[PDB]
Symmetry: C3
């Protein structure tokens, strides 16, 4: 029925985001994406703890999909025979059939093609949701990502002005539940199925062992720190499919923040810390003013420093002594 | 002193809501309600776990009371001699005397009549609050409900347009704390008083055993699923008197959401997931676009799927293939 | 370089706030503050539990600093040789160098002078953040306070009207993690260093033993209840540097609330309960209408009643029977 132009997107791994337009002169298109599910054992911390992950496209989070209002998003979801479990996909951006979940349940060896019309603007979670107790399990095993639906005129501040970002990053936060043995060491398992009983028991107690960005402690640091230059406006999309978070850029602010993540609402301005409700994505933009290292955290600092939820930015440019200066370096008290 | 017309309301059990006007040509009235407290042992899950509940009018949540701005709400609170504990009522909608709590403490065998002027619009929690450690205990035992204070002109979108709902449901969410024995089985108790010591010990650790809607796992499913038709605008009032929640309609959205619950503020639009602060009620309206089953959850999916916090909607009407379609059913990967 | 007038502030202990102007005709100044760090063992509850606290200026929270937009805040941070640990300060109001933390690390025996320009309006957390796992530890040991950056025209309602408070209080909420011995009694320690291992183990489990205002159970009660008169507009600044909170004034409302705490955004109106994201300060103003006792709580009522997070207001004036009246005192049921 649907006679619109087709455009393929090459997805890229988080925290990066596939190339896209903000404001566009294009009309509605059918935008084609492929997600291939991968179950895999991964390392989640610097001590070598392992984890039975379940992923879209091999990453935690799944990649960010970007379209415009009124596009049709046509996803080929692939569950190779090398996986063990059925899977599906639920888009919080979509209308009907449990977000798509009721139309996309696929066994290992199968694929399905779902299309949904992008009638709601904002950033939104997508996640697997097979049914029943498998829903939380697949999500907290890593099977969640996000999609961004931009207005065709790009972003605005609510107050008629365009808000154009120079770059965008996607920070997906994952609560993980790794059981411990009697000795107190984290357990390792041979399969997701073997991990399930212990993992569910822990899940129901509601306290994660790890809270990470991009799948692992320290993922968005060192070589893989986020970057910017003084003067650049950076959009940071943050999602959490199961559990609340409170993002904060240490040494910066949220200049324009959509904490509930939906562009039909004006952004709030000048925030210190914002709030991502579990089951949602939000977004914050900041124009960097100072060079140096920043930490981007959830501001439960226990989670940030001790459970894994810290990213860095390394920012280039000239220090601004008007905004901040060390008037007197550390010295002995007179 | 107060010479206004009197109107009696027949309360109805949640999730339903007693008949009322949205916009009205009536002026202020004294609106009369009766709440009769019932302490009772109830079943809270499909395994037969029992629970020492304390209720207004026999239900968890207590029933939704609906009035208009500037009405006077005159409540006869009754504590029959068949109960064991003192009780009272605190309305977050009311001004003075700890919300009414300091004027309504009644022993078994007593009743009291409190009137308060509805000067604040929105949805609001009411709950028992006897004093001290009994406050949390009575609340988490089930002694909470909500009241809705509508503008006399009905609801609006902030942007001069009326927002008229076709039906309203009240979802009261309850965190419950049922201790376990050494074997790991939930305990049963002969009285609320006998449950108290174990229950308080658990409460202070801040992790519920169950998180339910309408008093029990699965209460708002099967026969008792919520219903709608494609084209109907449904208001969903959600309250949580003690603990945060993050509502989400799976396959839908919050078209207009007052997550802090107060109609003096414009609604937010197009939300995926919203946030009910513990100690509050909020409200979301959605116009259904697709038939079929929806789940309405808190989007901590562990809580939703594993601890009890899932409702269903069954929606009648015609499927819209423009909004969503299964382009290719599950098939073997080529 | 900076040739502006200098003004010294004499800080005062919370919940009080040093004298300041709301609207002002002054231009930018360099506003001088001194904070002297004190590590000390304190009592945190009415049972005599002790706690290894780390403080700015001897108090939990640290004192509220008040300036205006475009002022420069020049803080002398002093770490006397009588302390054991290094410390620093991070202002969420400031731009660059991890909020100042990267420019203020001082060993016992040292002091440092940091200046930052107040370019963001609102209430903001400040806290110590030495590095790594020490960050959460110093914060949850008490090393956090707040700063308020007022517009030069004072506060407004977003809708061109001034919002002038008659008094302001600062409620700093502290999550505390005091381990228990095998017997189940809270442990005491001879030094912060000796407390660290047990305290970190508990911290990572994310459940506080105590949640207090102004450093101790019952701190803002009795002699030290907050006060008001009917007719007075009271601003209540609330901060939580590590963990969410949901403030509520029992028997009142938030007439004007900036829950995210930033004055570039209009306040919300008529709230029952608001939400302070961990890592932030927010503010609520209320004009008292009724005399008597109010409780100001976090509306996790377990936390409020059982873990320490209750303050009182004692309010003088004339009871308003229009707003609320006891129509019939407790009596036997007919
Ligand atoms: O930022 C969204 C917010 O801005 C307002 C204007 O106050 O509308 C702007 O954004 C809309 C969505 O992009 C545009 O359609 C509109 O033309 C533009 O003024 C609000 O209505 C909206 O909530
Ligand atoms: O939806 C509430 C929001 O709308 C505004 C207009 O932007 O006011 C509307 O609602 C008021 C409350 O019902 C009415 O009194 C008013 O006349 C109407 O325009 C905002 O002021 C308010 O925050
Ligand atoms: O309350 C802040 C809110 O109000 C608006 C008007 O709707 O702006 C007012 O506040 C600004 C900050 O103090 C002033 O600069 C402005 O002149 C005044 O109208 C909004 O723009 C703002 O979000
Ligand atoms: O801003 N520091 O946690
Ligand atoms: O929207 N699904 O959890
Ligand atoms: O408002 N009482 O918890
Ligand atoms: Cu899956
Ligand atoms: Cu979901
Ligand atoms: Cu009671
Ligand atoms: Cu209450
Ligand atoms: Cu310190
Ligand atoms: Cu911080």
């Amino acid at each position: 029925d649907l006679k619109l132009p087709r455009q393929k997107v090459e997805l890229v791994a988080p925290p990066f985001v596939h190339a896209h337009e903000q404001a566009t002169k294009q009309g509605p298109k059918i935008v084609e994406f492929k997600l291939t599910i991968e179950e895999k054992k991964v390392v989640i911390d610097e001590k070598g703890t392992t984890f039975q992950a379940m992923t879209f496209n091999g990453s935690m989070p799944g990649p960010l999909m970007v379209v415009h209002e009124g596009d049709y998003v046509e996803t080929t979801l692939v569950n190779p025979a090398t996986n063990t479990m059925p899977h599906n996909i639920d888009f919080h951006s979509a209308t009907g059939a449990l977000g798509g979940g009721a139309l996309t349940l696929i066994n290992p060896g199968e694929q399905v093609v779902l299309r949904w019309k992008a009638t709601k603007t904002g950033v939104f979670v997508y996640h697997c949701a097979p049914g029943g107790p498998m829903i939380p399990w697949h999500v907290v095993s890593g099977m969640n990502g996000a999609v961004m639906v931009l207005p065709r005129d790009g972003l605005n501040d609510g107050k008629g002005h365009a808000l154009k970002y120079d770059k965008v990053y996607y920070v997906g936060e994952q609560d993980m539940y790794v059981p411990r043995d009697e000795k107190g060491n984290f357990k390792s398992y041979d399969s997701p199925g073997e991990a399930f009983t212990d993992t569910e028991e822990m899940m129901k107690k509601l306290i994660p062992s790890h809270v990470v960005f991009n799948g692992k402690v320290g993922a968005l640091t060192g070589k893989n720190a986020l970057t910017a230059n003084v003067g650049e406006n950076v959009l940071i999309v943050h999602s959490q499919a199961n559990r609340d978070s409170r993002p904060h850029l240490i040494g910066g602010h949220g200049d324009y923040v959509w904490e509930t993540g939906k562009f039909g609402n004006a952004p709030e301005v000048g925030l210190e810390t914002w709030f991502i409700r579990g089951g949602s994505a939000g977004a914050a933009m900041y124009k960097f003013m100072q060079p140096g290292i920043y930490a981007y955290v959830t501001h439960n600092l226990i989670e940030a420093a001790d459970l894994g939820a810290t990213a860095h930015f390394k920012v280039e440019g000239k220090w601004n002594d008007d905004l901040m200066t060390q008037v007197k370096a550390p010295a002995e008290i007179p």
